[PDB]
Ligand binder design. Structure first.
Ligand SMILES: Nc1ccc(C(=O)O)cc1
Ligand SMILES: Nc1ccc(C(=O)O)cc1
Ligand SMILES: [Cl-]
Ligand SMILES: [Cl-]
Ligand SMILES: [Cl-]
Ligand SMILES: [Cl-]
Ligand SMILES: [Cl-]
Ligand SMILES: [Cl-]
Ligand SMILES: [Cl-]
Ligand SMILES: [Cl-]
Ligand SMILES: [Cl-]
Ligand SMILES: [Cl-]
Lengths: 303, 303
């Protein structure tokens, strides 16, 4: 809604950018592990057909398994390439969507995968890391759990890179300025590298498809306020030059998910693209998976 | 609002793409001039500091002056370079914002310029052409007025190019799919080359800044329906590689203007961009210029 008391100038000077934003995190693995205090950490990599990169991501994380990290899972989304065997060969446990939650038939898209991984994991903290990363850094998981383990009151940590992204810069952040202005303090709201506490994640809906990350950001903000969110610098990463046609369909789902969270009536109509004319249509989903907490008791595996 | 009866598939197969969309316009200047039937045509080029390109755009249009075109005006927006003298030297009349409407102090931005040009022009049809075009084609004005002069019931003509644009493809068209799905049939809703009848243009508000084009599209659609809009192929044009930082600020104003037209409460908060951090803020306007018709009677020059 209309917030004429807030300006872009005092968003740039917002105290949150100091106390909840780590440009140069200096935490050690040993001192993070010391702060677990009986909490466990689950790392989840969503994956659909990522055979060329999934092993390299898993290998950056595997040395933490059994110390800082308690579970390392690739949640496979129906890959037909060698994603699964390569993740296993790299030292990760691989769980299909069906095995994560066999009572419920899979919907397509990324959010489904992350939602199901709540039923497959046991960590008090869950870290999500994209499996398509071309050059992952082994300090990702430590930097993401830093504010959860050491700060107070943080429940969602968003990892950003110094160069980000055409959808992030033209779609997500300008819409947040219009609909959730305080969230413009988040550098990369769509980023795939982030960590959350279990109670938070079990009690929010998961948006479908590519809306999942911005949906968690906005639901966490709405539920707990800006102080409960933090961001940390993961380092440098090259913008993978994705086709604008793919980015357009993803943008449409980002819009749908944000409108869904902000009371904006979305038409539900998918995006048409023209290239006479050669038309290309995509679909968009307006239906969340409900909070996983609502399924407690009905599951053959406890939550 | 929610339109679950419409899908992206039947938008791609929409009859409008045949009867109101000209992929290969074949009109001659002589036969268009024959159809004027006493209507006059005003061509308007908005311009702020366009000394390198404005003359070349004017020269592509000047041979039509006195035949198909009755007025050729560059509406200068406070240029400090040689925009004005170069437009004059190319054969255009140059009118400042103040001379267009001296009773009202200028607001910044492009929409202000186009709104003021309604008071400075006399054509029954007004054609807007950007002055920063690097390679304008002399058939722009004929192709834009074709459907106005020959078809029935068209009041707004949008000229598109075969390659368009990151803001168009990731922001404008996906938001239209969410908020005004039928308008996704328009290939380039933000395009600067378009023509409109005077009665229509005098009776709609003009959005400020870079929102002006999408605001006219949505107001025309809301007021008169999709049949009153048409689009024509102008040919090929190179995407001028504008900085993503500029595109982000323009996207924010596009969003504000669309939310303004579609009942979506916009925060009014400008876009912050970060590059410690180096913050960069822009402003956004939620205030239209009212329909120029509302100022009739109060102007020292008649409308
Ligand atoms: N079904 C899908 C599962 C995962 C992903 C992804 O990780 O980007 C995308 C689609
Ligand atoms: N004040 C302005 C006037 C004109 C333009 C433009 O034509 O892009 C931009 C700004
Ligand atoms: Cl502001
Ligand atoms: Cl800091
Ligand atoms: Cl089901
Ligand atoms: Cl992006
Ligand atoms: Cl919580
Ligand atoms: Cl659809
Ligand atoms: Cl046609
Ligand atoms: Cl004034
Ligand atoms: Cl564009
Ligand atoms: Cl009208």
């Amino acid at each position: 809604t209309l917030v004429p008391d807030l300006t872009a100038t005092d968003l740039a000077r917002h105290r949150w950018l100091t106390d909840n934003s780590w440009t140069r995190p200096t935490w050690t693995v040993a001192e993070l592990e010391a702060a677990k205090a009986g909490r466990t950490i689950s790392v989840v990599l969503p994956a659909l057909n990522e055979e060329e990169t999934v092993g390299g991501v898993v290998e950056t994380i595997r040395p933490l398994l059994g110390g800082l990290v308690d579970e390392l899972i690739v949640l496979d989304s129906g890959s037909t390439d060698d994603t699964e065997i390569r993740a296993m060969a790299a030292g990760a446990r691989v769980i299909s969507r069906e095995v994560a939650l066999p009572e419920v038939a899979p919907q397509p898209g990324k959010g489904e995968v992350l939602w199901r991984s709540l039923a497959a994991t046991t960590g008090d903290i869950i870290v999500f890391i994209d499996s398509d990363l071309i050059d992952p850094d082994p300090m990702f998981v430590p930097k993401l759990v830093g504010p959860l383990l050491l700060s107070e009151g943080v429940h969602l940590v968003k990892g950003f890179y110094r160069r980000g992204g055409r959808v992030t810069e033209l779609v997500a952040r300008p819409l947040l300025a219009a609909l959730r202005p305080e969230l413009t303090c988040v550098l990369q709201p769509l980023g795939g590298e982030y960590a959350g506490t279990r109670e938070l994640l079990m009690s929010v809906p998961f948006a479908p498809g590519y809306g999942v990350e911005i949906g968690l950001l906005v639901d966490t903000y709405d539920r707990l306020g800006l102080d409960a969110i933090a961001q940390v610098n993961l380092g440098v990463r090259a913008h993978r030059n994705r086709p604008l046609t793919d980015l357009a369909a993803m943008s449409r789902q980002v819009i749908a998910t944000l409108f869904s969270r902000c009371g904006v009536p979305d038409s539900g109509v998918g995006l048409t693209q023209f290239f006479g004319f050669s038309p290309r249509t995509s679909e968009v989903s307006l239906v969340d998976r409900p909070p996983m907490n609502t399924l407690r008791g009905k599951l053959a595996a406890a939550l």
